[PDB]
Design a protein around this nucleic acid. Structure first.
Ligand code: MG
Ligand code: NA
Ligand code: NA
Length: 325
DNA sequence: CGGCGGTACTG
DNA sequence: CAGTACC
DNA sequence: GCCG
């Protein structure tokens, strides 16, 4: 953590680009910032800048301006719309397009949104839980939530295997939400159980809002919603559940454990090797066109364990706490 | 030049 | 489909 | 934004 004086200013720029919808420029910035944060010693030279992976001339020039003038002139020309765009796209279900649209329509505050904006069902829930959805819970509460789900699941099939993933599995002290993966060792009993589980969890008043939940489909893969533990002092928390076939267990676990950048790096690596990795499977002999798009499926490789995914990719295994990029 | 992860709901 | 979301 |  040796370049806070520069990265702190870059994260402001990255965030501005992000809420304005400039996703690839923002991405570039993210990789540079992350790089700078892992670099033990204070970069001291424009040459020493380019040196680092994720950093190039453009970014180097910025870092040079910050160490000499102790400032970044671009930070002074960030659009005034940015704080408002950030406020709006912090509503669950509203992204950069929606935020920019609301802004163009003259809205500047959540009060404007509440009173004048047209909201999707999701966004109305997002807004109702605006503050809650910005808070992190202690991992101890995540345990309680996982256990509430696990108990309700194992109540109608004790064979069900339930594991909390995401930041919880990566071992963080606090969690943004709870990610529960459910599967079954028998390979078939996982089918059409959202039906039973969600009903059970609604029965106990545990679920309060549904954000994403295709219950008309017998093939539902995920539930994204909102729960609240019983008793006083409790806040609404975001709950994400996925149910996967046992054969996809390792890939599902890897994906659902993250982090996001870790998943992307893994998947980017797989593609270099003519393979493909998703929450469903690791595939080989994947045929692609000249534009990187999948033109041919290939074969699914057997992956009983996360270790196998690493192995098939020619990588040393990493514990969840080490995937925390 | 041009890709930068791969996928699942919503409406 | 585009937008948003998941990790 | 970075990089092949
Ligand atoms: Mg999470
Ligand atoms: Na949002
Ligand atoms: Na629904």
């Amino acid at each position: 953590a040796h370049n806070l004086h520069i990265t702190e200013k870059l994260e402001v720029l990255a965030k501005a680009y992000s809420v304005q919808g400039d996703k690839w420029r923002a991405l570039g910035y993210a990789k540079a910032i992350n790089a700078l944060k892992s670099f033990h010693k204070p970069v001291t030279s424009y040459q020493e800048a380019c040196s680092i992976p994720g950093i190039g001339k453009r970014m180097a020039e910025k870092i040079i301006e910050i160490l000499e003038s102790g400032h970044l002139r671009k930070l002074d020309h960030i659009s005034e719309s940015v704080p408002v765009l950030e406020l709006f796209s912090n509503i669950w279900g509203a992204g950069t397009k929606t935020a920019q649209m609301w802004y163009q329509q003259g809205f500047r505050s959540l009060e404007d949104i509440r009173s004048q904006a047209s909201l999707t069902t999701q966004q109305a829930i997002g807004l109702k839980h605006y503050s809650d959805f910005l808070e992190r819970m202690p991992r101890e509460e995540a345990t309680e939530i996982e256990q509430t789900v696990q108990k309700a699941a194992q109540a109608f099939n004790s064979g069900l295997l339930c594991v909390a993933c995401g930041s919880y599995r990566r071992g963080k002290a606090t969690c943004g939400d709870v990610d529960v993966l459910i599967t079954h060792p028998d390979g078939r009993s996982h089918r059409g159980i959202f039906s039973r589980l969600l009903d059970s969890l609604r029965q106990e008043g545990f679920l309060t809002d549904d954000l994403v939940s295709q219950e008309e489909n017998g093939q539902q893969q995920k539930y994204l919603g909102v729960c609240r533990l019983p008793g006083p002092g409790r806040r609404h928390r975001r709950l994400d559940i996925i149910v996967v076939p046992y054969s996809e267990f390792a890939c599902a676990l890897l994906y659902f454990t993250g982090s996001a950048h870790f998943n992307r790096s893994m998947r980017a690596l797989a593609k270099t090797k003519g393979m493909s990795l998703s929450e469903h499977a690791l595939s080989t002999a994947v045929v692609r066109n000249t534009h990187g798009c999948k033109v041919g499926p290939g074969r699914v490789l057997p992956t009983p364990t996360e270790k196998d995914v690493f192995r098939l990719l020619g990588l040393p295994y990493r514990e969840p706490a080490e995937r925390d990029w």
